[PDB]
Design a protein around this ligand. Structure first.
Ligand SMILES: C[C@H]1CCCN(C(=O)c2cscn2)CC1
Ligand SMILES: [Zn+2]
Ligand SMILES: [Zn+2]
Ligand SMILES: [Zn+2]
Length: 572
């Protein structure tokens, strides 16, 4: 009932009752909030409501104090002070940006821009309000009842009438009834159970709606610069493999936190694991939002770090199969690999937060709350894909607004930059270097002469809103017959429905651009499918073409991105 103001920290008994997160607001800030917004309900020990029997006056601007009680203009006694006077709301211990965060629906890009350009306390308020709004929105979709079970991976579904149907992709995870977590892909629908269960008819699936806990810690702790490496002890015997990062490792020990921008295949995992070899006594917690990113760090650690000092932290409510080679849930091992939502309450000499473009400010703050560290290292690339913003429908979210770390990397620049791409053929490196890296990314490999582009719009059909381009898949099939080395290629597109069609017609393994992030393949076949803002996003385009080690075939819809591809053009 009593606490600190989310705008100026001033102690108060006031909480805004119309805010979904009921933030503590001081007399001055509470007034400036209620007078400028539709939010008029204020809560101290008791709510600011008219104490007269049967009276429904809840608006703090229409209320007064009659001794110790509160009454409206129609019930107040002769000796009564208006609650809203002289720029203040009466209570105990006697903002334009806060108003917009407190009242927005989170469907505009300007909402996310503000949630990142505001003060540190408003970034936490915005991140809590957003996540709570995203969860209360999950209650809007319809329930799925099972109609017929055809196979162990296919079924028919009956949807709730009157309530919209959720997009059927891997992003939407349903909880079935407790029969385990389940996912769906497109009359026949493909089912994937986290737990293997004999799918019963009539059984129902509902999207998992979880409680949003409040944020305490900042997204970024206050920066500290040191004259010497602090609390870390370097080797003198450091392997030549990691010699290239020694200056950067020293920078890591001379700052409270550091940012590393690593374009595709420039050495992010190598840098992250090498930091352990450079400070061999240091306890390092390796974290990321996804299980795939945490597993990719375990893969690199398995190669260089001692297996007995590693532990993979796996939450008991296991949703996907993850890294099985380290001792599980041994929180006290020198090297702890764990997703952000599973982090324990612990300390560390270094915390490495990988795939930073995927993190939200909610995740940035959670890490600072669970982990007390001497040093924090943020590794990622603001030119890669951010976390999906399910509520955002109007406007495009620029990289400087993905989270606080990404904002710093795009404004003041990253502290460290891995400038040499060792994965991609030079055609790909030169294309993305000009596109998203200001011509600062360099190619280690030569031009492979196996990078092709085809300008082919085809025909766009739609599975609900997920797009399909059968003529683009037909062009791929003709190319495959003439280029049999490409049999081993991974098929990539911005749409899961395009991928489902390509899987049946081509038989190639499939991946969306968003699920391909962090992975690499010898050959990639990419069909743009449409000319939407989604398929034309330069960050998605960057991730798509940088998956290839040897060759890439790009069947393009957009003239702009097609012309920017420094690939050999093909006819038909
Ligand atoms: C270079 C100098 C100024 C700009 C970046 N900065 C922050 O924005 C920040 C970190 S934690 C809170 N604020 C602090 C460090
Ligand atoms: Zn205040
Ligand atoms: Zn409010
Ligand atoms: Zn009244």
């Amino acid at each position: 009932a009593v606490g600190a103001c989310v705008l100026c920290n001033s102690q108060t008994s006031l909480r805004c009752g119309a805010c979904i997160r009921r933030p503590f607001l001081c007399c001055k800030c509470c007034y400036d909030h209620v007078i400028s917004t539709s939010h008029k309900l204020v809560l101290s020990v008791n709510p600011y409501v008219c104490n007269a029997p049967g009276c429904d006056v809840t608006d703090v601007t229409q209320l007064y104090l009659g001794g110790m009680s509160y009454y409206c203009k129609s019930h107040k006694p002769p000796i009564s002070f208006p609650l809203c006077a002289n720029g203040q709301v009466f209570g105990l211990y006697k903002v334009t940006d806060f108003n917009a965060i407190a009242t927005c629906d989170w469907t505009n890009a300007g909402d996310y821009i503000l949630a990142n350009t505001c003060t540190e306390r408003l970034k936490l308020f915005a991140a809590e309000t957003l996540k709570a709004t995203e969860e209360t929105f999950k209650l809007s979709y319809g329930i799925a009842t099972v109609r017929e079970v055809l196979s162990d991976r296919e079924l028919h579904l009956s949807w709730e009438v009157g309530k919209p149907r959720p997009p059927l992709n891997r992003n939407y995870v349903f909880t079935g009834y407790q029969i385990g977590e389940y996912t769906f892909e497109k009359d026949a629908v493909v089912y994937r159970g986290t737990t293997t269960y004999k799918l019963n008819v009539g059984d129902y699936f509902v999207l998992t709606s979880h409680t949003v806990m409040p944020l305490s810690a900042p997204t970024l702790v206050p920066q500290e610069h040191y004259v010497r490496i602090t609390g870390l002890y370097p080797t003198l015997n450091i392997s030549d493999e990691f010699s290239s990062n020694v200056a950067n490792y020293q920078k890591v020990g001379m700052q409270k936190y550091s940012t590393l921008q690593g374009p595709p295949g420039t050495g992010k995992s190598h840098f992250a694991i090498g930091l352990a070899l450079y400070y061999p006594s240091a306890r390092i917690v390796y974290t990321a939002c996804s299980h795939a990113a945490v597993d990719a760090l375990c893969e690199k650690a398995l190669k260089y770090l001692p297996i007995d000092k590693c532990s993979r932290i796996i939450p008991a409510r296991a949703r996907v199969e993850c890294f099985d080679k380290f001792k599980v849930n041994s929180t006290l091992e020198q090297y702890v690999f764990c997703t952000v939502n599973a982090l324990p309450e612990t300390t560390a000499d270094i915390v490495v937060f990988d795939e930073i473009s995927m993190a939200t400010n909610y995740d940035l703050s959670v890490v600072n709350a669970r982990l007390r560290a001497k040093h924090y290292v943020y590794i990622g690339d603001p030119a890669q894909l951010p976390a999906p913003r399910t509520l955002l429908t109007k406007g495009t979210l620029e990289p400087e607004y993905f989270n606080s770390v990404c904002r710093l990397m795009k404004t003041i620049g990253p502290d460290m930059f891995l400038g040499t791409c060792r994965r991609c053929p030079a055609e790909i490196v030169d294309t993305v270097s000009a596109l998203v890296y200001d011509n600062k990314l360099k190619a280690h490999k030569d031009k492979s002469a196996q990078c092709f582009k085809m300008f082919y719009k085809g025909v766009i059909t739609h599975d609900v809103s997920s797009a399909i381009n059968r003529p683009q898949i037909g062009v791929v099939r003709e190319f495959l017959t003439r280029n049999p080395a490409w049999r081993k290629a991974v098929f990539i597109s911005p749409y899961n429905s395009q991928n489902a069609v390509a899987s049946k017609i081509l038989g190639l393994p499939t991946q969306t651009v968003d699920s391909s992030q962090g992975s690499e393949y010898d050959y990639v076949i990419f069909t743009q499918t449409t000319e939407t803002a989604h398929s034309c996003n330069v960050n998605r385009f960057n991730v798509a073409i940088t998956r290839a080690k040897v060759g890439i075939l790009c069947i393009m819809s957009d003239r702009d991105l097609y012309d920017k591809l420094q690939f050999t053009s093909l006819e038909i």
